[PDB]
Structure formats: C-alpha cells, structure tokens
C-alpha cells in the first residue's frame, strides 16, 4: 500500500492512520482546524492506497482546498 501525499510529515499518519482510505471524501477544506496544526494549507493532495486482499483492494487520494 502505499500512501503518497505532501505534506505527509503529519498528513499523512492522519489521513492514512484512519484507515489507509479517504473514501469517504477524497476532500478537504483548509479550514479544519487539522490541518491547520500541521500546517497543510492548502491546495494539498493526499493519496492513500491499500490492499488487501481480504480486503480488498482500494485507493484512494484527498485533497486539502480552500474555499472557497
């Protein structure tokens, strides 16, 4: 699996730890005041992938915007 986004210094054990997904909205707005103590700001993607098999098998991607 792998999880690909930017600011991932924190962003990305906190999209990912949730659960590797983003399902449930691949969406973002900067004014969470998350993202705002890790300083992600943005316009920021997140991609989060995960596979398992028993699982199964998915990716997923956020993205901080906003806005606006």
């Given at each position: 699996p792998k999880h690909e986004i930017v600011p991932k210094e924190e962003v990305e054990?906190?999209?990912?730890?949730?659960?590797?997904?983003?399902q449930q909205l691949p969406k973002i707005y900067e004014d969470d005041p998350v993202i705002q103590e890790i300083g992600a700001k943005e316009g920021d993607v997140v991609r989060v992938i995960r596979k398992s098999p028993t699982?199964?098998?998915?990716?997923?991607?956020?993205?901080?915007?906003k806005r606006i």
């Open positions: 054990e906190i999209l990912k730890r949730y659960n590797i997904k983003i699982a199964g098998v998915s990716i997923a991607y956020r993205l901080v915007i």
